[PDB]
């Protein structure tokens, strides 16, 4: 199975008073491990997972100095963009930025990302090849020209194919007790009564990691999308996740309906039945 390391950055301008709010968070897979908030006393990158606290003081200074520099970059970006798009300083604006690497099943580099959004719209993205850019409009074209001339893709390749995969592998190592342990979903089925002739089966998948999951209803072997609700996958709050699907069926016919479950912590898939 493949692994990932992602840093998510957000700067929101504050036109009323002061500088922009900058929040940064770091993940290995679906597990948060670092945070920075400019609205905290700390002013340090903080840990959010037990495995990362192994890392000595030079790591933490290192990450704080960097995370603080990214804040300053994004402050300026909020300004530049404001000028590109001719906006006033009355309004509050948001810059987002995400970047990271994946390793394959083979524990080598698979993909790198490095992409930006403005006011929640795609702005400028680094492509799969890590040698070209997708600019969404003529403001991001301005950014693109700069970045071609300046050999920016080349610099982010060194990181995405090098340092980034190195540290992902280090973390997955030091944190293997949890990070390389898949929790299979604890499943069970529940049964409500919409009417005398109509009842609702529901299929629950609880306390599973990672979040990736598929729940599918089958009537008499055939997949059935009709008469089914579902919820988006949701965090349990303890680092695991929850999801359910439900189907509406004739009372008495619940033996026909089965719930299939694919989760990368399950060798064979599962089949519940009422």
């Amino acid at each position: 199975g493949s692994h990932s390391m992602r840093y998510f950055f957000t700067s929101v301008s504050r036109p009323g008073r002061g500088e922009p709010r900058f929040i940064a968070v770091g993940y290995v897979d679906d597990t948060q491990f670092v945070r920075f908030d400019s609205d905290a006393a700390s002013q340090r990158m903080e840990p959010r997972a037990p495995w990362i606290e192994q890392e000595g003081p030079e790591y933490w200074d290192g990450e704080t100095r960097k995370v603080k520099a990214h804040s300053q970059t994004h402050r300026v970006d909020l300004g530049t963009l404001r000028g590109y798009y001719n906006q006033s300083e009355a309004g509050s604006h948001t810059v987002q930025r995400m970047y990271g690497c994946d390793v394959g099943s083979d524990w080598r580099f698979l993909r790198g990302y490095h992409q930006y959004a403005y006011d929640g719209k795609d702005y400028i993205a680094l492509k799969e090849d890590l040698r070209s850019w997708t600019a969404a409009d003529m403001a991001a074209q301005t950014t693109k020209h700069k970045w071609e001339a300046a050999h920016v893709a080349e610099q982010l390749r060194a990181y995405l194919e090098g340092t980034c995969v190195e540290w992902l592998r280090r973390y997955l190592e030091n944190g293997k007790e949890t990070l390389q342990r898949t929790d299979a979903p604890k499943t069970h089925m529940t049964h409500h009564a919409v009417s005398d002739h109509e009842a609702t089966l529901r299929c629950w998948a609880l306390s599973f990691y990672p979040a990736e999951i598929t729940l599918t209803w089958q009537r008499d072997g055939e997949d059935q999308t009709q008469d089914t609700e579902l919820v988006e996958t949701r965090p349990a709050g303890d680092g695991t996740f929850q999801k359910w699907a439900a189907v509406v069926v004739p009372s008495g016919q619940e033996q026909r309906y089965t719930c299939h479950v694919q989760h990368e912590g399950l060798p064979k898939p599962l089949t519940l039945r009422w």
């Binding site: 970006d77 700069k146 610099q155 340092t163």
Partner: peptide
Amino acid sequence: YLSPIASPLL
């Protein structure tokens, strides 16, 4: 590990 490289400006 955040990118040590001076980040690019838009």
